[PDB]
Design a protein around this ligand. Structure first.
Ligand SMILES: CCOc1ccc(-c2ccc(C(=O)C[C@H](CCN3C(=O)c4ccccc4C3=O)C(=O)O)cc2)cc1
Ligand SMILES: [Ca+2]
Ligand SMILES: [Ca+2]
Ligand SMILES: [Ca+2]
Ligand SMILES: [Zn+2]
Ligand SMILES: [Zn+2]
Length: 159
């Protein structure tokens, strides 16, 4: 339902999981945003200080937003749809072991999914869609949004 009422969107990574190298975390997030900017008019800018539309945070259990994480497994992360304050923010359960590839929960793939929510997309029934409600691992270098994912994000932002 909610949508960002602009095309220039900013994000900021509040903290970094010790699971990965700082650079790998920044890259995974940057790449996830580009997945969406590539098929819409949306342009994402990363800020290292100041307010951002989308705040990326790694945390375990209760972290202040009333939706406490649940330990290893189960919910891996969560995000809030477009809106002020908490709206748009993407949180990742530190109790998961974040990885660049298959050695655990893939940050890149998870981020693409969560940012979809940050942009206003809900869950699809299409098993091929990244917005499908259940996590799935695939070779990150050959990852591609499904036609359903594209249709959904373009009906919201065009292009
Ligand atoms: C080719 C790769 O395909 C993939 C497809 C799906 C996923 C994937 C990644 C993470 C998760 C989760 O951690 C579960 C998490 C649950 C909470 N959660 C939300 O934040 C949310 C926002 C908007 C609508 C519904 C929900 C919702 O149920 C949630 O649904 O965000 C679930 C699925 C990862 C990769
Ligand atoms: Ca969890
Ligand atoms: Ca926000
Ligand atoms: Ca961790
Ligand atoms: Zn949270
Ligand atoms: Zn989801």
């Amino acid at each position: 339902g909610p949508v960002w009422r602009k095309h220039y969107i900013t994000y900021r990574i509040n903290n970094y999981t010790p699971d990965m190298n700082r650079e790998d975390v920044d890259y995974a997030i940057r790449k996830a945003f580009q997945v969406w900017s590539n098929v819409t008019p949306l342009k994402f800018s990363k800020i290292n200080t100041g307010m951002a539309d989308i705040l990326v945070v790694f945390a375990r259990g209760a972290h202040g937003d009333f939706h406490a994480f649940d330990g290893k497994g189960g919910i891996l992360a969560h995000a809030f749809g477009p809106g002020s304050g908490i709206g748009g923010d993407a949180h990742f359960d530190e109790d998961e072991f974040w990885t660049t590839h298959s050695g655990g929960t893939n940050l890149f793939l998870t981020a693409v999914h969560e940012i979809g929510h940050s942009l206003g997309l809900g869950h699809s029934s299409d098993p091929k869609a990244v917005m499908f409600p259940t996590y799935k691992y695939v070779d990150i270098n050959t990852f591609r949004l499904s036609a359903d994912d594209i249709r959904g994000i373009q009906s919201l932002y065009g292009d």
